[PDB]
DNA sequence: TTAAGTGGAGCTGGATGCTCTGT
DNA sequence: TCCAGCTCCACTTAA
RNA sequence: ACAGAG
């Protein structure tokens, strides 16, 4: 912890004297004998998370279900739509289909 | 006019908060060894603090 | 240095973040304005 | 089950000392000054980690201020005191402040290059298996820990795969990764093209880029080098070495 | 250093850690009741927040002007030196000061009653300084040392310096622009 | 620990058994299938077990070539192996009249000793393997196709079918880990059997250079 | 005690899409 | 505006 | 050197 000299207000340093450890100024004679226990606790942040993920419900909390893919036609699906390329005047979609765990991903 | 104040306060030496080993060295550094004609500190120690 | 830490901030983590710059300045013997001007003057690109 | 997955997760993910210590205090006494670290053993119980006081004593004395093993004690099973000495090189003995902010960033368990690891579970209804997606850059370490099936683990960085598993595995990695990136954006290339690209990158025993640096090691023609990039320097080098050039 | 360190399933006792931690630093060499070892209680080192100076020991809300004047009047009879700021011009004419409509300050007025101070219901404090009422607000609260001194130059080369007391609080006065503007809107 | 440390001394020993079985050295069948609980029998945990000189392999002779063609496997104990320990192993190898030796360092090797392993002798060839590379057999990995070191009478038929030279083949380096697994020097040709998407297989060739 | 081989850090030099159509 | 080579400097081993 | 066009 920062502690400052009552005289000149520079920063104190800890050093050792002939009877005690002392807080001492570097620029004036002031010293302060450590007579008793003095402490400073940091209390850092612990690693709070454990973070298991990738569950199927964490995958299918998106709108689409019971639609039709051009590959395997299954109802349990995971869709996506893009538009952010205006060279593509048509729309952009991508689909995931996992009822039979077939796993297609096409345009 | 052009109001500027300078003070000088006398700090003691008999208290435990005065490391005399460092005070003798800083008084030898600022003053001459035995000149004392004009001098920042009077004795052989840092006696004053100027404001 | 107390007035410098007063102007920067008097929170705990602010002082803890700023401390290694006071500890760096105390390594050199800069304690007076004439010393600081002498240190900065010898870094100036002379025009 | 995930009880086994978190063990090997904690064996590879980088864990800091400050992440498991519930307080790190400096204690000034009339006879000595030191720094005390109290470990939070409840979190060690819940994170399922192989760390205690004696292991933290051995993780310290690794590239920190050159502390001595006599300076560190293990008084309990949770407390560890680190008594500092003189750094004696551009530092004051008040270097207690250096270990006040540097000792919480030492590593006590796992691999130093792994930023984070995560448990990822599958989608199938006939099974449920738990893989381990690791965000790091040390393939050799993650292959070699106890409990990770090292024969079936891969990477995305071709340089690590070349350095660890050879040039042929790097060729396979280039093929798989280019084909994966082309599939994810809806494109479709026949695999013979990416096969030819990977064989061109890896026919001199080393994965070579398609920069001007990889092209300077493959092609031999001087005008082919000077027609692409750094047009001046190849000309003076061919003048210096007296290098003749076919028009092949 | 032997690397293959061994560990066990047993659960650490709470008090066993507490008493080990206790025994690690509760030892004290305070037995030296001697002069050097002694320490001056009025020259402790300054912990940085000046309201929070005491780091070693023998063992906040923000007040307002009505709470400021109540504690100095009802709670205590003892007088207190304040430090109040004024607006830039006080609402008067410089009395035969050889002018231009320039600034009118306290250096141009005379002794005698200059106004009255009205503490209203619900914390409103005004300074009726003639026909206009100013507004009094607590300023930034200082926590460092301030001394009110009298420097008298009784002779050309020498004189007297005398300390009158410590100044704690700082007040701020400001014109009520809404009431000044609501007389004649524009 | 001591459930995971003796695991390493088991797994590294098993991988060195397979590495010696693939180089044409005589390995018995039980050593290739030495069970962990059976490895507990001849050596227990670290207070009863001894690391550095109890797990050596000098039984290994080239059963294809010759019974005097022999090779050491040493497990040094200190993490950074200096020149002195290399000189100890070299004088032991000088005593037994063996030409080839392996060294399994635990953390690394000092840079003046990596310089030593090249220039001590061309007749005394020594290979540094880290103990972290031997915790898995890289030939068993699914990204690594099966390599086969070729005889001179097969290299000659390779270079006669395509009408080539040696320096027109593709290259493999000698610092390649799969090259150091088989222990191959400059001038040998490996056969790489690549698996396909179909049941077919595409054969290819690399020169050590 | 010091000769030396090798890490890490700062400096330097290279590169950054294809055409026509006019002022 | 981003990124490989080149050179300078502390940091251990070894005698 | 600037503006256009695909
Ligand atoms: Zn001071
Ligand atoms: Zn589909």
Swiss-Prot record, chain C:
Belongs to the RNA polymerase beta chain family. Component of the RNA polymerase III (Pol III) complex consisting of 17 subunits: a ten-subunit catalytic core composed of POLR3A/RPC1, POLR3B/RPC2, POLR1C/RPAC1, POLR1D/RPAC2, POLR3K/RPC10, POLR2E/RPABC1, POLR2F/RPABC2, POLR2H/RPABC3, POLR2K/RPABC4 and POLR2L/RPABC5; a mobile stalk composed of two subunits POLR3H/RPC8 and CRCP/RPC9, protruding from the core and functioning primarily in transcription initiation; and additional subunits homologous to general transcription factors of the RNA polymerase II machinery, POLR3C/RPC3-POLR3F/RPC6-POLR3G/RPC7 heterotrimer required for transcription initiation and POLR3D/RPC4-POLR3E/RPC5 heterodimer involved in both transcription initiation and termination. This is DNA-directed RNA polymerase III subunit RPC2. The chain holds residues 248 to 294 of 1133 of the full protein. Coiled coil: none annotated. It comes from Homo sapiens. Transmembrane segments: none annotated. The gene is POLR3B. It is linked to Leukodystrophy, hypomyelinating, 8, with or without oligodontia and/or hypogonadotropic hypogonadism: An autosomal recessive neurodegenerative disorder characterized by early childhood onset of cerebellar ataxia and mild intellectual disabilities associated with diffuse hypomyelination apparent on brain MRI. Variable features include oligodontia and/or hypogonadotropic hypogonadism.
Curated annotation (Swiss-Prot), chain D:
The gene is POLR3A. DNA nontemplate strand binds at residue 66. Catalytic core component of RNA polymerase III (Pol III), a DNA-dependent RNA polymerase which synthesizes small non-coding RNAs using the four ribonucleoside triphosphates as substrates. Synthesizes 5S rRNA, snRNAs, tRNAs and miRNAs from at least 500 distinct genomic loci. Pol III-mediated transcription cycle proceeds through transcription initiation, transcription elongation and transcription termination stages. During transcription initiation, Pol III is recruited to DNA promoters type I, II or III with the help of general transcription factors and other specific initiation factors. It comes from Homo sapiens (Human). This is DNA-directed RNA polymerase III subunit RPC1. Expressed in the brain, in the cortex and the white matter (at protein level). Signal peptide: none annotated. Belongs to the RNA polymerase beta' chain family. It is found in: Nucleus; Cytoplasm, Cytosol. DNA template strand binds at residues 212, 230.
Curated annotation (Swiss-Prot), chain E:
It comes from the Eukaryota. There is a cross-link at residues 43, 54, 184 (Glycyl lysine isopeptide (Lys-Gly) (interchain with G-Cter in SUMO2)). Sumoylation on Lys-43 can serve as a signal to mark misfolded Pol III for proteasomal degradation. It is found in: Nucleus. The modification Omega-N-methylarginine is found at residue 1. Component of the RNA polymerase III complex consisting of 17 subunits: a ten-subunit horseshoe-shaped catalytic core composed of POLR3A/RPC1, POLR3B/RPC2, POLR1C/RPAC1, POLR1D/RPAC2, POLR3K/RPC10, POLR2E/RPABC1, POLR2F/RPABC2, POLR2H/RPABC3, POLR2K/RPABC4 and POLR2L/RPABC5; a mobile stalk composed of two subunits POLR3H/RPC8 and CRCP/RPC9, protruding from the core and functioning primarily in transcription initiation; and additional subunits homologous to general transcription factors of the RNA polymerase II machinery, POLR3C/RPC3-POLR3F/RPC6-POLR3G/RPC7 heterotrimer required for transcription initiation and POLR3D/RPC4-POLR3E/RPC5 heterodimer involved in both transcription initiation and termination. Belongs to the eukaryotic RPC4/POLR3D RNA polymerase subunit family. This is DNA-directed RNA polymerase III subunit RPC4. It comes from Homo sapiens (Human).
Curated annotation (Swiss-Prot), chain F:
GO terms for cellular component: cytosol; nucleoplasm; nucleus; RNA polymerase I complex; RNA polymerase II, core complex; RNA polymerase III complex; RPAP3/R2TP/prefoldin-like complex. Keywords: Acetylation, DNA-directed RNA polymerase, Host-virus interaction, Isopeptide bond, Nucleus, Transcription, Ubl conjugation. It holds the Pfam family RNA_pol_Rpb5_N. Gene3D superfamilies: RNA polymerase, Rpb5, N-terminal domain, RPB5-like RNA polymerase subunit. There is a cross-link at residue 80 (Glycyl lysine isopeptide (Lys-Gly) (interchain with G-Cter in SUMO2)). It is found in: Nucleus; Nucleus, Nucleolus. GO terms for molecular function: DNA binding; DNA-directed RNA polymerase activity. GO terms for biological process: protein stabilization; transcription by RNA polymerase II; transcription elongation by RNA polymerase I; tRNA transcription by RNA polymerase III. PROSITE patterns: RNA_POL_H_23KD (PS01110). DNA-dependent RNA polymerase catalyzes the transcription of DNA into RNA using the four ribonucleoside triphosphates as substrates. Common component of RNA polymerases I, II and III which synthesize ribosomal RNA precursors, mRNA precursors and many functional non-coding RNAs, and small RNAs, such as 5S rRNA and tRNAs, respectively. Pol II is the central component of the basal RNA polymerase II transcription machinery. Pols are composed of mobile elements that move relative to each other. PANTHER family: DNA-DIRECTED RNA POLYMERASES I, II, AND III SUBUNIT RPABC1. Belongs to the archaeal Rpo5/eukaryotic RPB5 RNA polymerase subunit family. It comes from Homo sapiens.
């Amino acid at each position: 912890m920062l502690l400052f000299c009552p005289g000149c207000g520079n920063g104190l340093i800890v050093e050792e004297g002939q009877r005690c450890h002392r807080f001492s100024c570097n620029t004036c004679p002031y010293v302060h004998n450590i007579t008793r226990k003095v402490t400073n606790r940091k209390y850092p942040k612990l690693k709070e998370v454990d973070d298991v993920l990738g569950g199927a419900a964490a995958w299918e909390n998106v709108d689409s279900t019971a639609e039709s893919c051009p590959k395997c036609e299954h109802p349990r699906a995971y869709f996506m739509q893009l538009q952010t390329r205006s060279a593509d005047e048509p729309m952009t979609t991508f689909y995931k289909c996992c009822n039979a765990q077939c796993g297609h991903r096409w345009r | 006019k052009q109001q500027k104040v300078e003070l000088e306060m006398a700090i003691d030496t008999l208290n435990p908060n005065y490391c005399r080993s460092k005070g003798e060295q800083i008084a030898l550094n600022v003053d001459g060894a035995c000149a004392d004609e004009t001098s920042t500190y009077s004795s052989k120690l840092m006696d004053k603090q100027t404001f | 240095d107390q007035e410098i830490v007063q102007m920067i901030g008097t929170e705990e983590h602010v002082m803890a973040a700023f401390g290694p710059s006071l500890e760096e300045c105390q390594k050199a013997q800069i304690f007076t304005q004439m010393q600081a001007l002498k240190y900065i003057g010898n870094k100036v690109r002379r025009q | 089950d995930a009880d086994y997955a978190r063990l090997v997760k904690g064996r590879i993910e980088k864990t800091l000392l400050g992440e498991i210590s519930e307080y790190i205090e400096e204690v000034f006494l009339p006879d000595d000054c030191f720094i005390l670290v109290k470990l939070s053993l409840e979190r060690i119980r819940l994170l399922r980690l192989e760390v205690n006081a004696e292991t933290v004593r051995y993780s310290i004395c690794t590239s920190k201020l050159r502390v001595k093993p006599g300076d560190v004690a293990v008084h309990g099973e949770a407390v560890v005191c680190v008594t500092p000495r003189e750094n004696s090189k551009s530092s004051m003995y008040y270097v207690l402040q250096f270990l006040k902010e540097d000792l919480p960033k030492v590593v006590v368990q796992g691999i130093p290059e792994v930023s984070r690891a995560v448990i990822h579970i599958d989608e199938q209804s006939g099974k449920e298996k738990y893989k381990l997606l690791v965000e790091g850059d040390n393939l050799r370490a993650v292959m070699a820990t106890h409990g990770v099936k090292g024969t079936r683990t891969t990477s995305n960085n071709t340089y690590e795969v070349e350095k660890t598993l050879g040039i042929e595995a790097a060729r396979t990695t280039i093929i798989n990764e280019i084909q994966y990136t082309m599939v994810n954006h809806g494109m479709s290339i026949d695999r013979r093209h990416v096969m030819l690209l990977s064989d061109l990158m890896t026919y001199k025993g080393e994965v070579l880029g398609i920069t001007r640096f990889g092209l300077a090691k493959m092609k031999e023609s001087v005008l082919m080098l000077a027609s692409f990039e750094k047009t001046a320097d190849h000309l003076f080098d061919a003048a210096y070495f007296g290098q003749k050039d076919s028009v092949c | 250093r032997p690397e293959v360190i061994q560990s066990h399933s047993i659960f650490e006792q709470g008090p066993a850690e507490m008493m080990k931690k206790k025994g690690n630093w509760d030892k004290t060499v305070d037995v030296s009741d001697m002069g050097p070892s002694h320490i001056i209680n009025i020259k402790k080192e300054k912990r940085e927040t000046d309201e929070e100076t005491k780091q070693i020991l023998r063992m906040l809300p923000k007040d307002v002007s009505v709470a400021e004047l109540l504690r100095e009047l009802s709670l205590t009879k003892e007088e207190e030196l304040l430090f109040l700021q004024l607006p830039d011009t006080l609402p008067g004419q410089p009395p035969t000061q050889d002018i231009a409509e320039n600034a009118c300050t306290l250096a141009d007025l005379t002794e005698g009653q200059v106004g009255k101070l009205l503490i209203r219901k619900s914390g409103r404090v005004q300074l009726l300084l003639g026909k206009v009422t100013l507004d009094v607000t607590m300023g930034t609260a200082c926590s460092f040392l301030q001394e009110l001194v009298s420097v008298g130059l009784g002779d050309s080369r020498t004189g007297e310096m005398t300390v009158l007391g410590h100044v704690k609080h700082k007040l701020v006065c400001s014109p009520d622009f809404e009431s000044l503007l609501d007389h004649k809107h524009r | 620990d001591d459930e995971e440390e003796t695991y390493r001394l088991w797994k590294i020993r098993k991988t060195i058994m397979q590495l010696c079985h693939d180089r044409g050295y005589l390995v018995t069948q039980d050593e290739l299938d030495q069970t962990l609980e059976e490895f507990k029998a001849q050596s227990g945990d670290k207070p009863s077990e001894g690391r550095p000189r109890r797990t050596d392999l000098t039984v290994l002779v080239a059963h294809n070539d010759d019974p005097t063609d022999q090779m050491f496997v040493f497990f040094p104990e200190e993490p950074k192996v200096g020149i002195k320990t290399i000189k100890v192993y070299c004088q032991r190898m000088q005593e037994e009249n063996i030409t080839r030796a392996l060294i399994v360092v635990q953390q690394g090797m000092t840079p003046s000793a990596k310089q030593s392993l090249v220039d001590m002798a061309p007749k005394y060839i020594l290979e540094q393997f880290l103990q972290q590379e031997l915790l898995i057999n890289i030939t068993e990995h699914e990204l690594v196709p099966e390599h086969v070191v070729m005889t001179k009478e097969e290299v000659t038929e390779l270079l006669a079918r395509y009408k080539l030279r040696e320096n027109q083949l593709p290259r493999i380096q000698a610092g390649d880990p799969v090259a150091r697994y088989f222990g191959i020097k400059r001038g040998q040709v490996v056969k790489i059997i690549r698996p396909s998407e179909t049941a077919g297989r595409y054969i290819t060739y690399r020169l050590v250079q």
